């Protein structure tokens, strides 16, 4: 996260860390949506151009963290995966369209003051909150600058951008399964997600029922916090039917 601040303890109790076993390393961010399901970006697991294709056995999910490198004994929980489901039409070849994946944990995790799931939006919440100008929040342990890694979880609040503006900021083809967010060069405010943050949540707080909903998943961007550019996120609600399906089918 570039131009973000340290998060508070228990601020994003649904933030997850996809950790690699060997080498032991931070791979991506993810979110806790139930006591057994984690949501992340498919490119965090499968990306043939760079030969990435991870399996259950290569990943570990660390929930309840704050500090990036320390094993927060008695506070965080580490779970193994039982299954990984990538969206059947994830498009890694052209623009990372449908960059979403679900991971089933081996065992249910118990909630605590540091571990709690986020809600997934329903048609009406998507409709009322995904409006240009409204701010969302992104969190992660990713890089602090494009080219510098943090000790604690970072947070940044960013506005959603009109789709015309997003399309005219890149040569990549934007689909209806993505949205972009960030300030304009003309807003004297900065911020963006950066490498290491992919897979984490873009959330909004409903002013109707005070709950936090996960509207997007950090997907891609061209550099970090570059002026004229924005970060793109997978549109969770447009892929919700795929989510419900694997969850009530598995």
């Amino acid at each position: 996260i570039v131009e973000g601040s340290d998060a508070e303890i228990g601020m994003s109790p649904w933030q997850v860390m996809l950790f690699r076993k060997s080498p032991q390393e931070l791979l991506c961010g993810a979110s806790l949506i139930s006591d057994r399901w984690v949501l992340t970006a498919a490119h965090c697991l499968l990306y043939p151009p760079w030969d990435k294709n991870f399996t259950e056995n290569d990943l570990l999910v660390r929930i309840g963290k704050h500090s990036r490198t320390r094993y927060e004994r008695n506070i965080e929980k580490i779970s193994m995966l039982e299954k990984i489901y990538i969206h059947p039409r994830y498009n890694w070849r052209e623009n990372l369209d449908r960059d979403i994946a679900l991971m089933k944990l081996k065992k249910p995790v118990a909630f605590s003051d540091y571990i709690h799931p986020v809600c997934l939006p329903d048609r009406e919440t998507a409709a009322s909150l995904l409006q240009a100008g409204y701010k969302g929040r992104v969190t992660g342990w990713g890089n602090l600058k494009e080219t510098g890694q943090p000790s604690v979880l970072q947070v940044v609040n960013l506005p959603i951008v009109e789709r015309p503006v997003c399309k005219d900021s890149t040569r990549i083809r934007i689909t209806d399964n993505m949205f972009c967010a960030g300030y304009k060069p003309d807003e004297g405010k900065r911020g963006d997600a950066c490498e290491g943050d992919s897979g984490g949540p873009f959330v909004m707080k409903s002013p109707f029922n005070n709950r936090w909903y996960q509207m997007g998943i950090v997907s891609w961007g061209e550099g970090c916090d570059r002026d004229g550019k924005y970060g793109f996120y997978t549109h969770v609600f447009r892929l919700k039917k795929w989510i419900q399906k694997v969850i009530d089918q598995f």
Binding site: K21, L60, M80
Partner: peptide, 11 residues
């Protein structure tokens, strides 16, 4: 850079 985590999570 990352501190070691308990062996039971590797297995």
């Amino acid at each position: 850079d990352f501190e070691e985590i308990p062996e039971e999570y590797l297995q």
